[PDB]
Every structure is written in structure tokens, then in C-alpha cells.
């Protein structure tokens, strides 16, 4: 499936650029209109929607639960949400607000003992392991936010039933240069029991086509949709052919 993505800061749909320390900088504001954007995405056939709560990421005390509740209610397609999910209570709050899947990167690589417990409480279908991948000079898929590889972390969670992984090539985020096809070809084949979502870099319709047959189950598209490189409708018809 095609998975359209929005970044949210205090109710605003934003463009950000990832910085060194896991930090980032706000580039563009697209508007204060997340719900109509999501409804248009759904109307065009998007089967899943992706939201990153950057406000909650900075400060979990400020998680945008009331907004998320409204956004989930206002469409009839499942929404997955990430952003500074740190505790079992955070996961529960998001599911209670009507989120279909909770997306977790930082806490999952930092505190595997804790997050394993979440798998056992909520079940594997409720949780998406998000991997912020940096390929180093040696070819290692680094995912720390000492080092941790993609493979090491996937293996960490397979025993508690890991099924969904969002694999972001963070150097590709917002570049419009294409997603990392070879990376997805490799990891999808290595873990055929896992449903990988690709993320970062989609630039034009050819880039969607290029991920067909890689094994990727979901293609996250952010910037290209926001800046009208193509519509959700045509992304879907490319992806489904
Ligand atoms: N500074 C950041 O931007 C950022 N930091 C963490 N995440 C993710 O937040 C989640 C939870 O992280 P954590 O549990 O808080 O550590 C993890 O997945 C982290 O990887 C980010 N992603 C934000 N938007 C991503 C987005 O809108 C589309 O994916 C992107 O525009 C698609 O690429 P494209 O435009 O099409 O090139
Ligand atoms: Na689709």
C-alpha cells in the first residue's frame, strides 16, 4: 500500500530537516489543516495514514492526543502514529484515542527490555518498530539514536513476535531523490515474515514503481505528496500495478 505521511507540530503540518543530534529544524509550514488533507488522502483510496507527532517527540507531556483523536475520528482508514512514545502508558493513550498502530524508534533501540513488555501487553499488530537507519562507511546499518545494527534490533524483537518495521533511510528524508531500493530488497528478503514499510526519498511516480517487487509492504510518502509531485490516486495505481 501507499502510506501518505504528515508531520505535526502544535496542530501545524510542517516540513522539517533532520539534524545531527537527532535534532531538527523547521523549514516550511504547509498549513493548520491536517484533517482535510487526511480526508482527501483517504478519498483517493489511501488505506493507511501516517502521522508523526513532533510536539510529543520533544515533550511527551505535550503529546497531541486531543488532535490525534479528532484526526482518527474524521477518517475511516487506520492511522499509525509515532513521536516520542516512551512508556506503556503512552502506547495505551494512543490506542485509546483510536490509533491503529503505534510507531516507536528511540525507546525501542534504547530500552529493549521495556518495549518487549509492550509487545506482550498490546500484541504485535499494534506496534511498529521504527528504524532510523544510517549506513556507515563499513556498510553497517546503524540504528542507534555503542552501536546497534538494524539486524541486531530486528533479532532483539523477533522473540516477542515482531511483525511490522518502518525502515527509514534518514539521509533520504525529503530529498526527492528516490528511496533506498537495494536496502529494502535486502532486508525484506532477510526477514520475509516481517512487513517492512519503506520511508524517505520518494520523488516521483517512477520511485514508487521502483519499489514494486522489492517485498516492501507499505510505501511511506511525505514531501512528494505535499508538494504535488503526484496525487495519491496515481501513486496507488502505479503501486498496485
Ligand atoms: N526530525 C524528524 O523528522 C523525525 N525524528 C523522528 N522521526 C520519526 O518518528 C518516528 C518515531 O520516532 P521516535 O520514537 O520519536 O524516536 C520514527 O519513524 C522516526 O523516524 C522523524 N520523522 C518525521 N517525519 C517523517 C515523515 O513525515 C515521513 O516519514 C517522511 O516525510 C517520508 O519521507 P519523504 O518526505 O517522502 O522523503
Ligand atoms: Na495502495
Query: What is the grid cell recorded at 43?
Result: 478519498
Cα 27 to averaged position of ligand 2 atoms, centre (Å)? 29
User: What's the reported resolution, in angstroms, to a tenth?
Assistant: 1.8
Query: For residue 170, how far is the Cα from the chain centroid?
Result: 11
Q: Return the C-alpha cell found at 111.
A: 530500552
- The total number of residues shown for the chain amounts to 241
Task: Report domain extents, the chain.
Answer: 1-241
Pocket probe mutation, ligand 1, options 3, 21, 173, max atoms within 8 Å of Cβ: 173
**149 secondary structure, DSSP code:** B
Cβ atoms of 48 and 100 closer than 8 Å: yes
Q: Are 73 and 119 in contact (CB under 8 A)?
A: no
Residue nearest atom 6 of ligand 1, based on CA coordinates: 83
Q: Cβ neighbours of residue 187 under 8 Å, at least 6 residues apart? A: 141, 150, 154, 165, 167, 196
Tell me, using a 6 A CB cutoff, whether residue 83 lines ligand 1.
Answer: yes
Instruction: Give the ligand with the smallest distance to the CA of 7.
Output: 1
Q: At what angle do helices 150-157 and 181-190 cross, to 10 degrees?
A: 30
- Ligand at shortest distance from the CA of 234: 2
CA distance 22 to 3: 23
Report the C-alpha dihedral over residues 187, 105, 97, 5, rounded to 10 degrees: -60
- Binding site membership of 16 for ligand 1 (Cβ less than 6 Å): yes
CA of 131 to the centre of ligand 1 (A): 10
Give the count of beta carbons closer than 10 Å to the beta carbon of residue 27: 10
Q: Residues 6 or more apart from 49 whose CB is under 8 A from it? A: 3, 4, 5, 6, 38, 41, 42, 75, 77, 78, 79, 80
Q: Pick the residue whose CA is nearest to atom 16 on ligand 1.
A: 106
Decide: 34 in ligand 1 pocket, CB within 6 A: no
Best residue among 82, 170, 179, 210 to mutate for probing ligand 1, ranked by most atoms within 8 Å of CB:
82
The grid cell for 83 is: 513521536
Fold type of domain 1-241:
TIM Barrel (3.20.20)
Euclidean distance between CA atoms 241 and 227, whole angstroms: 24
Are the C-beta atoms of residues 35 and 56 closer than 8 Å to each other? no
CA of 107 to the centre of ligand 1 (A): 14
In this structure, are strands 141-142 and 164-169 parallel, antiparallel, or unpaired? Answer: unpaired
Amino acid at each position: 500500500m501507499i502510506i501518505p505521511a504528515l508531520n505535526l507540530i502544535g496542530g501545524t503540518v510542517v516540513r522539517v530537516v533532520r539534524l545531527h543530534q537527532g535534532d531538527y529544524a523547521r523549514l516550511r509550514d504547509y498549513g493548520n489543516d491536517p484533517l482535510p488533507r487526511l480526508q482527501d488522502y483517504a478519498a483517493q483510496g489511501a488505506g493507511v495514514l501516517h502521522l508523526v507527532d513532533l510536539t510529543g517527540a520533544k515533550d511527551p507531556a505535550k503529546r497531541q492526543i486531543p488532535l490525534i483523536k479528532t484526526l482518527v475520528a474524521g477518517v475511516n482508514v487506520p492511522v499509525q502514529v509515532g513521536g516520542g512514545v516512551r512508556t506503556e502508558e503512552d502506547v495505551a493513550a494512543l490506542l485509546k484515542a483510536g490509533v491503529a498502530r503505534v510507531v516507536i524508534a528511540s525507546t525501542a533501540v534504547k530500552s529493549p527490555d521495556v518495549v518487549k513488555g509492550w509487545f506482550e501487553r498490546f500484541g504485535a499488530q499494534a506496534l511498529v518498530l521504527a528504524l532510523d537507519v544510517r549506513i556507515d562507511e563499513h556498510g553497517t546499518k546503524q540504528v542507534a539514536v555503542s552501536g546497534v545494527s538494524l539486524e541486531q534490533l530486528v533479532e532483539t524483537y523477533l522473540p516477542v513476535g515482531l511483525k511490522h518495521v518502518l525502515c527509514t533511510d534518514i539521509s533520504r528524508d525529503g530529498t526527492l531523490a528516490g528511496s533506498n531500493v537495494s536496502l529494502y530488497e535486502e532486508v525484506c528478503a532477510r526477514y520475509p515474515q516481517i512487513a517492512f514499510q519503506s520511508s524517505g526519498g520518494i520523488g516521483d511516480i517512477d520511485d514508487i514503481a521502483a519499489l514494486r517487487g522489492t517485498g516492501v509492504r507499505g510505501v511511506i510518502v511525505g514531501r512528494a505528496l505535499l508538494e504535488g509531485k503526484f496525487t495519491v490516486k496515481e501513486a496507488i495505481q502505479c503501486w498496485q500495478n
